[PDB]
Every structure is written in C-alpha cells, then in structure tokens.
Ligand binder design. Structure first.
Ligand SMILES: Clc1cccc2[nH]cnc12
Ligand SMILES: Clc1cccc2[nH]cnc12
Lengths: 264, 263
C-alpha cells in the first residue's frame, strides 16, 4: 500500500482469499470490514502513528461511534480490490474516516464506507470534545476542502436509528466472543459486532438477497466475559431490518443498526 | 503466489495484517492455519483443480483426518512470511499435505506443518481407500522421492492421541459457530476447531507461555446447528490433552494435544 501523491489519502490492493468468501464465492461484509480496518491502520502507520503525542500523554484514544457501509458488488474469490481511505475532522465533535472500494481491473466503484470516531479517556471511558492542541496535530494529514464518500443530501449514513421494541421478530441468543474475536489490545474487534448483528437475519433472506447497506451505532463495549443477544425486526423487492444487540442478562444496549437487502 | 520451477510445490508470501495478531503483536495460530489453507487452495488452483474429474463424478471429496503444526517464531504484524506447500500420496490410505514457513528476510524456517487427508463420499460420509484411477490422476502433481516436513521417524506428528477422561481440569461450554465460521460450502471451517480447542486453555498460560506444537484429530464435523464443549487437562514446558464434544450426548468431534513453552 501507499500514500497518494498529495500525501492526504492512502491506497492498498487486496487479493480476496478462499476463507474470506461466503456461499456466493464473493467476500463477506465482515471480510470487507476487516479490509477497511487494515487500510485504516496502514494509513496511520504511513504518517507516523492512531494516537498523537498529546493523546498518549493524556491517555486518550479514538473510538468508533458509527460505521456505515454500502456495497454494490462484493469481490469474488481471487479478485483484486483497491481501497482508498482518508480522514477529516468534523470540528470538535470528532473525526470521520471514509473509504472507496474499487474493482482493480475496471476501475469501477464497487463500494463505499464512512465512520464517525470520538475521543475517549482509555481508563475512565468518558467522552470529550477534541481539543485544539490535539486537532492541530492531525490537520496536516487531512484534506482541507470537504471530501465525502457520501456527498448526497438525504443520505443513509446520517439517519437516526430507533430502538427495537420487544418482542423482536427474530433473535439469536447467547452469543459470546472467543480469542479470535479479540484485537491486539484484548478488546472485542468492531467487526465481531457486525457478525453478531447479522446472526439474527433469517437464512431465507441470506439465500435470496444480498446485503446492500449496513449502518451500526456503537453505544457500549462487549467485555471478553459478556454474553450477547442479537435481535432483528423487518421494517419494510427490497427488505429492510432494525437491529439491536444487548447484554443477555439485564438487556443493557451495546449496539443498534439497520440493514437494507436487495433480491439476488 | 507461484508453482516452483519443477512444478511439484507452491510458494506464496503474505504480509501479516493488524487484525491477524494477538496480544504479543504476532500472528495467532488460527491466522497461521488460515494462511496454510489459502496456500493449499492456491496450489490446487494452479494445477487445474479440490477434486479430480473422476472424484466429481463419484461424489468424492478430500477430508482432513489430522493437522499437526509446529511454530518456532510467530510472524509480527507487518512482517512478510513465505510458505511452501506440497502433497504426497501415502499408498491407498490417503494423501499428506506439508508446509514450511519461513521468514522472508532471513530465509530461516519459522514453522512447519503436516496434514493427513482421507477420501469420503460427500453424501453418505463413508470413508474410502483412494483406489488406482484416482491415485494416477494426482501422482503427476506430487514429488516421487519422499519429501517430509517432519522427517524424523516416530516424531510428534505421528503420536496416537488418547481420550480425555472426565472430570476435565478446565472447560469452555456452549461454543457455537456463527456465519463467519463457515466456508464457501456452508461447512464449519477446520480452523474454527483449533480456536475452540484453545478456548479451554487458562488465561495464565496464554499470558506466560507461547504455543509451540498443536496436533488435532478430526473425527466428526460440528453441524451449523450443533453446540460444542471444549475440555482440557494438563498432562505435564506445559502439555495439555484436549477434547471437543457435542454439548448434549457428548459425541466426540475432535481430540488433540498442545505443547507450550515459557515466554
Ligand atoms: Cl491515522 C490518521 C491518518 C491520517 C489522518 C488522521 N486523522 C486522524 N487520524 C488519522
Ligand atoms: Cl490440490 C493438489 C495439488 C497437488 C497435488 C495434490 N495431490 C492431491 N491434491 C493435490
């Protein structure tokens, strides 16, 4: 992978692996999400990081608040996908990382994603607005003119997500993370929550439809010793669902989301 | 990746990814196992396949009976690992696939693995000795002189594994596969069973030791709707005996052993 000529974005190519594909012999949305994470990490590494000198001193970290992915064509096993990523501040609220996925051969856009990140103290887990000293350290690595993966006016990435009310139409109960679900800091990988959301989609949908859009809000972290219930209700040729992940016991919310599926 | 000059083995390089590493910032044994599977698949693709024309007509498939992996150094995040793989028949019993892992920069061997595969009818799940017409179709893609990743006679890869007796010293119960654990044919990926075996190793061991050897026998498949219990007892460097079995009736799906060395 490499930073582009202007040094304000990063591009990397990936060959889709045999264990990365589903029943259609195309990459799953979890493989795509893992590739977005990888290109994000390689981008931070290329520019010197993803915490700054001031963030490490203050025990501050970036945490995902929302992930929004739209896939037009999932890459097939053996195909090469090219992914371009960049960051931009949104004032003191936080930062946005965007991605564009392309077919390496045709140059056609096959997907796009956006994520909203907030600053949080690693120890107290208390959120905070981005300081000016921290903001200044990041500004030189972001484009100054707005560059959005989702420029559209009434676009899906910014829609508010309601809370699913019991009884859910479908559920998957007792989901727990294993060591493979953890990252290098022993925290549950963000992509695991996407998998858990999709566990409560009925098999018939997975067999007849393809996942087009997924928007996920992250409210609370699942600890290594927590157990999760995944709930889904149909809200709708296109099927739409409302999703809720909550702790098995008291029902504390960890995530909420929506998916849009189109007939194959 | 590419077939080597003689066309009898296959080599491919991999850059270790951020989500592929554990707390030591080095690749997990499940990432290694996924990479072995990937290089095996690319090898079959490069030579025309993973079944032959005759196997497809008779509804026959290759299935793993045993996996044995030995890692000396796990590759760090961002490092390049080179893996070479080849196959060899073992008479009509089945076939063996071997692998050698190397540090791309130093050329030093960092790991090795061997697996034993048997032929099975995919519908009836009945085992079968290979035959002659099927054997002949494969022979031209294998070396003729023996080439073993574990040459030593009566080495760790060939040791018989006993059945763990209750009560187990440690256990992880209620393990179930999710869609990410399935392969392209909707069967549980073989690497998932490695993860499930390791779930019952105590955290203290994972924190103070590194996994050096893992041998796993595959007796029965976990179906998409099955629930598994992972059992472990210390038999000792630390060594453990492992058993995976269905949550209800306790039908055995896998047995194995691990060897761990102090960090
Ligand atoms: Cl990791 C990284 C690379 C470039 C720009 C960034 N802004 C916030 N984090 C960034
Ligand atoms: Cl897939 C594959 C490649 C080369 C040799 C083989 N023998 C059995 N299967 C093989």
């Amino acid at each position: 992978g490499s930073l582009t000529e202007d040094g304000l974005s990063y591009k990397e190519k990936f060959v889709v692996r045999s264990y990365e594909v589903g029943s259609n012999k195309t990459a799953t949305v979890e493989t795509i999400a893992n590739l977005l994470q990888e290109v994000g990490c390689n981008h931070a590494q290329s520019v010197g990081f993803a915490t700054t000198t001031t963030m490490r001193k203050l025990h501050l970290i970036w945490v995902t608040a929302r992930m929004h992915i739209e896939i037009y064509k999932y890459p097939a096993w053996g195909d090469v996908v090219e992914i371009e990523t960049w960051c931009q501040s949104e004032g003191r609220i936080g930062t946005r990382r965007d991605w564009i996925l392309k077919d390496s051969v045709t140059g056609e856009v096959t997907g796009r994603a956006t994520s909203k990140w907030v600053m949080m103290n690693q120890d107290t887990r208390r959120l905070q607005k981005v300081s000016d000293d921290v903001r200044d350290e990041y500004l030189v690595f972001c484009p100054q003119e707005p560059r959005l993966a989702f420029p559209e006016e009434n676009n899906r990435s910014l829609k508010k997500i309601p809370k699913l009310e019991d009884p859910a139409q479908y559920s998957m109960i007792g989901l727990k993370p294993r060591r493979a679900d953890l990252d290098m800091n022993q925290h549950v990988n963000n992509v695991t929550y996407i998998g858990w959301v999709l566990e409560s989609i009925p098999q018939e949908i997975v067999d007849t439809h393809e996942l087009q859009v997924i928007t996920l809000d992250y409210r609370r972290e699942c600890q290594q010793d927590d157990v999760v219930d995944s709930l889904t209700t149909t809200t709708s040729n296109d099927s739409q669902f409302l999703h809720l992940l909550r702790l098995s016991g008291d029902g504390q919310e960890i995530n909420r989301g929506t998916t849009l599926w189109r007939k194959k």
